[PDB]
């Protein structure tokens, strides 16, 4: 018969396989089963789902607000008084805000985590459109952090690194960015800088190399390529 093919809830969650188409102590098992079912490939505080699982599933199956509500509520009231959970929730919320295109909420959320006053001032300047001032603030923050009087997180490090480049792009510093991308092997940034600040397209000598780069970055198609 096998060849031809709370109890109800558990059976549905993990008892059956859909590939063809409640004691508290037992809830964790159902949570694990639901996590397993959510991420299966064949597709296409009582109940807790990891923030990043919800984020990843929403970004692909159009469930933005459903995940955002839980993320913001957890931010308001953490489920577990731990640093790792708070970090993960904040990172997922920031990623969703950035993807959704809400600059104001992203900057506001990030301004509540930054420890350096220089980072806060840089973000404030970035919000209002003063790119050079924000770049200077980021440089000052990095220089201050070089000494080592007070520790800092890796998120702020990455934020400085990325936002300096963003401000440089907004300020049309393509000559610097081209060398930076060539040194750091940033293919997308290199292509963007070359498409703007050179004439490699006139002759095959450089066009062949540019096409080689394009076909190299074409294994992960996106609308911008």
């Amino acid at each position: 018969t096998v060849r031809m093919e709370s109890a109800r809830l558990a059976y549905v969650i993990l008892g059956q396989n859909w590939d063809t188409l409640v004691p508290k102590e037992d809830r964790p098992d159902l949570e694990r089963g639901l996590v397993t079912l959510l991420t299966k490939d064949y597709h296409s505080p009582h109940c807790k789902i990891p923030p990043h699982v919800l984020k990843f599933e929403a970004k692909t199956y159009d469930a933005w607000y459903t995940a955002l509500h839980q993320l913001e509520n957890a931010a308001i009231k953490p489920e577990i008084d731990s640093a790792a959970v708070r970090e993960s929730n904040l990172d997922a919320l920031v990623d969703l805000y950035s993807t959704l295109g809400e600059d104001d909420l992203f900057y506001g959320t990030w301004r509540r985590r930054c420890q350096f006053v220089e980072t806060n001032a840089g973000l404030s300047y970035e919000q209002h459109g003063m790119w050079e001032k924000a770049q200077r603030m980021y440089e000052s923050a990095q220089i201050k952090a070089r000494t080592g009087v007070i520790p800092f997180s890796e998120a702020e490090y990455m934020l400085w690194e990325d936002h300096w480049v963003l401000c440089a792009q907004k300020l049309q510093q393509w000559e610097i960015l081209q060398d930076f991308a060539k040194h750091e092997n940033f293919q997308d940034l290199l292509l963007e800088c070359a498409w703007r600040n050179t004439e490699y397209w006139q002759n095959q000598e450089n066009r062949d190399q540019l096409d080689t780069v394009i076909k190299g970055v074409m294994d992960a198609p996106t609308p911008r390529r």
């Binding site: 060539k182 040194h183 092997n185 290199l190 190399q209």
Partner: protein
């Protein structure tokens, strides 16, 4: 030898990643597919293999390493037991 003792892709940046992983003797772990995969690419870039390696090479290498260690240990054991 004395020096050994005293548009484009920046391949040196990728090659310098070989020294950012602990050795088996340092971590106390027998090498597996993941570690061998991490080791493969800098070697390929050193030799001018710009297309990397085949997807199925790391598993083959791990099997070969286990076979080699088993042979050495068997040879040692059979002479003293």
């Amino acid at each position: 030898v004395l020096m050994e003792h005293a548009l484009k892709m920046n391949f040196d940046l990728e090659i310098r990643k070989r020294y950012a992983q602990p050795l088996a003797v340092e971590s106390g772990e027998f090498p597996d597919t993941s570690n061998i995969e991490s080791r493969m690419l800098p070697f390929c870039y050193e030799a001018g293999l710009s297309s990397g390696h085949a997807p199925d090479a790391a598993q083959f290498m791990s099997i070969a390493t286990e076979t080699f260690i088993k042979e050495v240990m068997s040879a040692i054991f059979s002479r003293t037991r």
